[PDB]
Amino acid sequence: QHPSLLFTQEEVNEMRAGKGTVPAFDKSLSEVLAAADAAVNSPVSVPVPVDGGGGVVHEQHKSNYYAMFHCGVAYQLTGDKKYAAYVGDMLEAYAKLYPTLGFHPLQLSPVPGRLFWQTLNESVWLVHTAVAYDCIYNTLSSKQRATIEKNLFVPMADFIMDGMGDNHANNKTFNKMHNHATWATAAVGMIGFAMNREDYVKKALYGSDGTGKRGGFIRQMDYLFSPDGYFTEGAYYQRYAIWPFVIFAQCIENKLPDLKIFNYRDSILSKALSTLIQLSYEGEFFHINDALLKGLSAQELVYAVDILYNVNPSDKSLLSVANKYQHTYLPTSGGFKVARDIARGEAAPIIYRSSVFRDGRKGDEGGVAVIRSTDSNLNSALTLKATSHGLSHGHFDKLTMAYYDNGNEILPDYGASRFLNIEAKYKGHYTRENQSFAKQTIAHNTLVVDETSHFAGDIKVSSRYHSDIIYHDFNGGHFQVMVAKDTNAYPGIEMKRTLAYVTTPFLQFPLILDVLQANADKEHQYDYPIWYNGHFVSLNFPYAKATNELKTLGTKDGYQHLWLEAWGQNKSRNTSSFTFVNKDRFYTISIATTAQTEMKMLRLGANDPDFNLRNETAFLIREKARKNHTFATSIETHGEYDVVMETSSNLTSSCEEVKVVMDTASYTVVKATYKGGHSVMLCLSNTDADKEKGHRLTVEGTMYAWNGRCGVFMK
């Protein structure tokens, strides 16, 4: 009967008999045992709660649940009674303390805990401590178990479910479709499994009323993901959210195998993990919405990989995720199996595929589209984000694009402004500049109208709406294309964005064409920003540069944070080109312009009194007093630049012209001309998205015929 949460007795016996046969697993287990030994060698401290996040007491109780977790696992994997004694002594200290605790003295959280300032931390503590208890259960006397369950576990589970006294806010969280409810239901269900309390299990799975209609872990699996396994807050918070799902699902599979939890909703948990992998580049998640440095190496993804690979070991690509990015394994049958199958040479390459991940519970509220390189000599990704808002972490970023190549982020998404766990920098919280800059439209690679963010930067307005991915073709032979549309970011303005990834026979690397159409009945200022990662090489037009004084580009909606470093116009050519270098590769952005277009080089860092912003750079194209406008862009990747060997070639752009050669209600046509008499013609049906519809168009005496929304012609 015990253990059964993280593993069964048979599985523990197997792991112990297998010691020495898989060195990588042995190394991970040794690290668990070292953590447990460190806890055992230290005095036990269970202080009266007095502080919030980062406080010494808060951090002590957090350390305690990790210590109990590690000691319970260590006891199971070694049989050494000192680990079980540690857990038992600490549980008896908690059972003495907990009956004396009212609501936490700190008046800050809308759902205050008793052990912690917020109930979320109480739930995380209980998940880990339920595992510890399960691991040491048989070493305790009946008297000890009765006291611990009566004075600690039953009151804590009841509190997480229902609150206390007159404050029942915890019950609203318990039944919510939210990550904090995933933790609360995992905590209550896992301690219910450990105590054989079927009522806790039922309410964790199906909500307080048991119907599954207005709460519960199962319903969360139906509501917190799209049908493609996409979590609407983004990839960084999807990483956080997947962790309690896979932990609790593994417990459910051990105790209730006939529920087939890992098949539920077409194996939604597997889809979540797959989506996380397909939304990463070089192991790092695309920094959409609020996001910090985080990727496939995170412990949440070690849990997800080891648990889900154990459920379907035919998915050998997961072994590569573990071997390339994780190098560590759970102390479970699944972690052992991952390390063992890696050692047997079974890992298969990770296959990154162009994809559309739909947003919304039903998949009908926008999406994220990713075009992936298909040539095995290359390593590139191009993203187009056309989602719902994204709840509290959402950015005002409809139709934003990003480009990744050659191991690097080339045209980036900024992510969040936040200095995790650095108390001296805004106590580690999201900074003022996360709201005033990082969420604003100008921080992104997308259209900004009249120096105003999408939805005027109002979360409640933005939360009404979503963009649409309206067309895609990832199998065009010589190209891939994706198209998105938004009509609510700026009421009265229709925005469309087409991104084509074209493999020409005449350029060194695949070409990207971007076409951003804005259609309005009133005049506006249209800003087209391209944030770039690298060092300035050249502009093909004259510019002025700040000499001894720098001023800001604007005053509001993020523009107050932008230094205006250089500015210029192109009076002599119809195409304006910016070349920069990133590591050993050059990139050229070429855009169709007129003599009235304004070009600006920007650098982040103004109005930043606390040094909360990075020194990032952008190339901005500004059009004044336009009703309809088409931004047409060629993005070239070119050149070999070896500083160690001191060699170089193809360092200059080959783009001679970008021109909109037709722009009617029915069709928009862009011609990009390259050295040697070569060209790419991109033909766009503006008014339908039918994959099978045929089109014919005449440009410059030549007839262009194609099927589907977008035609790509090369010569």
Residues near Ni ion (CB under 5 A) are 395, 413
Label the pairing between strands 280-281 and 284-285. Answer: antiparallel
Query: Which of 364, 368, 111 has the alpha carbon at shortest distance from 230?
Result: 368
Closer residue to Ni ion (CB): 203 or 395: 395
Catalytic residue among 206, 237, 309, 587: 237
Closer residue to Ni ion (CB): 11 or 413: 413
Min dist. Cβ of residue 289 to Ni ion (A): 6
| Inter-residue contact 189 to 196 (CB < 8 Å) | no
Min dist. Cβ of residue 291 to Ni ion (A): 7
Distances (CA, A) of 279 to 81, 156, 352, 403: 44, 37, 9, 13
CA 381 to the chain's CA centroid: 15
Min dist. Cβ of residue 385 to Ni ion (A): 8
For the chain, counts of helices (H) and of strands (E): 18, 30
Closer residue to Ni ion (CB): 431 or 654: 431
Give the three-state DSSP class for 161. helix
Read off φ and ψ for residue 680, nearest 5 degrees.
-125, 130
**Largest CA-CA distance found in the chain, in angstroms, rounded:** 94
Closer residue to Ni ion (CB): 272 or 291: 291
Min dist. Cβ of residue 177 to Ni ion (A): 24
- Give the residue closest to Ni ion by C-beta: 395
Give the three-state DSSP class for 88. helix
In the residue annotation, 393 being an active-site residue is answered as yes
Min dist. Cβ of residue 493 to Ni ion (A): 21
Min dist. Cβ of residue 492 to Ni ion (A): 25
Min dist. Cβ of residue 288 to Ni ion (A): 6
Closer residue to Ni ion (CB): 52 or 367: 367
Residues 458, 459, 465, 470, CA torsion sign:
positive
Tokens read off for 223: 């509501």
Closer residue to Ni ion (CB): 393 or 709: 393
In the residue annotation, 678 being an active-site residue is answered as no
User: Over 499-542, what HEC string results?
Assistant: EEEECCCCCCCCEEEEEEEEECCCCEEEEEEEEECCEEEEECCC
Q: How buried is residue 589: exposed, middle or buried, by Cβ count under 10 Å (0-12/13-18/19+)?
A: buried
Closer residue to Ni ion (CB): 395 or 638: 395
Sheet containing strand 468-473, edge to edge, reads: 468-473, 479-486, 494-502, 511-519, 629-638, 585-592, 575-582, 535-539
Catalytic residue among 61, 70, 128, 393: 393
Peptide bond preceding 47 in cis form (omega within 30 of 0): no
Min dist. Cβ of residue 529 to Ni ion (A): 12
Return all residues near 552 (Cβ < 8 A) that are at least 6 apart: 559, 560, 561, 562, 563, 564, 606, 607
Quick one: residue 509, left, alpha or beta (phi over 0 = left, psi -120 to 50 = alpha)? Answer: beta
Min dist. Cβ of residue 464 to Ni ion (A): 20
List for the chain the helix, strand, coil content (%; round to 5): 35, 25, 40
Min dist. Cβ of residue 414 to Ni ion (A): 6
Distances (CA, A) of 447 to 388, 397, 399, 630: 17, 9, 8, 11
For residue 381, the one-letter residue type is: A
Total count of residues recorded for the chain: 715
Per DSSP, the residues of 372-416 read E--STT--EEEEEEE-B--GGG--S-TTEEEEEETTEEEE-----
Closer residue to Ni ion (CB): 380 or 400: 400
Q: How many CB atoms lie within 10 A of CB 521?
A: 8
Closer residue to Ni ion (CB): 104 or 395: 395
Closer residue to Ni ion (CB): 49 or 394: 394
Active site residues: 237, 393
